[PDB]
Design a binder for this molecule. Structure first.
Ligand SMILES: O=C(c1cnc2[nH]c(=O)[nH]c(=O)c2c1)N1CCCCCC1
Length: 167
């Protein structure tokens, strides 16, 4: 038993809700919140910008130190950093950005990072400003992630669509 409420169960291990991931992290305080990161951990907009602003820019400060030490992530890769006031840890995961021409097949590799964590609160990778089809992203999620994932979808219209079209 865990503290996630209001979710619709999609599969044995995938749950979905219409929620603001920032507000959901603020109330659940999950062990892991997933950020829709880029390779530079520049948290300027989208989920990333929203999560970072909720940390009063502390996420960005930590991220800049990480990059200064380690260099950029790979597309399809991830790193574990602090969750600040939102979660214990933030898993920064880089899905391919279709608006940069990145290969969509890397979306499966991105979701594989979730399997290193027993439970996660997450957005749909490569959705929103990353330009991928959120329905395809949901299919890859279901077919790749084996651990327990609670998907927060900000847009109510999108949500209702994802549910109605789910197989
Ligand atoms: O990007 C935002 C977001 C960020 N900052 C905001 N600041 C404000 O004053 N009003 C807003 O609606 C607002 C929205 N979201 C999408 C990704 C996370 C889910 C919640 C909202």
């Amino acid at each position: 038993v865990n503290s996630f409420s209001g979710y619709l169960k999609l599969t044995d291990n995938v749950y979905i809700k219409n929620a603001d991931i920032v507000e959901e992290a603020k109330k659940v305080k999950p062990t892991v919140v997933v950020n829709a990161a880029n390779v530079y951990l520049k948290h300027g907009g989208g989920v990333a910008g929203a999560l970072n602003k909720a940390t009063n820019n502390a996420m960005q400060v930590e991220s800049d130190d990480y990059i200064a030490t380690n260099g950029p992530l790979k597309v399809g890769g991830s790193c574990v950093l602090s969750g600040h006031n939102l979660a214990k840890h933030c898993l920064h995961v880089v899905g391919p950005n279709v608006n940069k021409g990145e290969d969509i097949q890397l979306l499966k590799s991105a979701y594989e990072n979730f399997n290193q964590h027993e439970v996660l609160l997450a957005p749909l990778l490569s959705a929103g400003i990353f330009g991928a089809d959120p329905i395809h992203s949901l299919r890859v999620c279901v077919d790749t992630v084996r651990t327990n994932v609670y998907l927060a979808v900000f847009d109510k219209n999108l949500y209702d669509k994802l549910v109605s079209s789910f197989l």
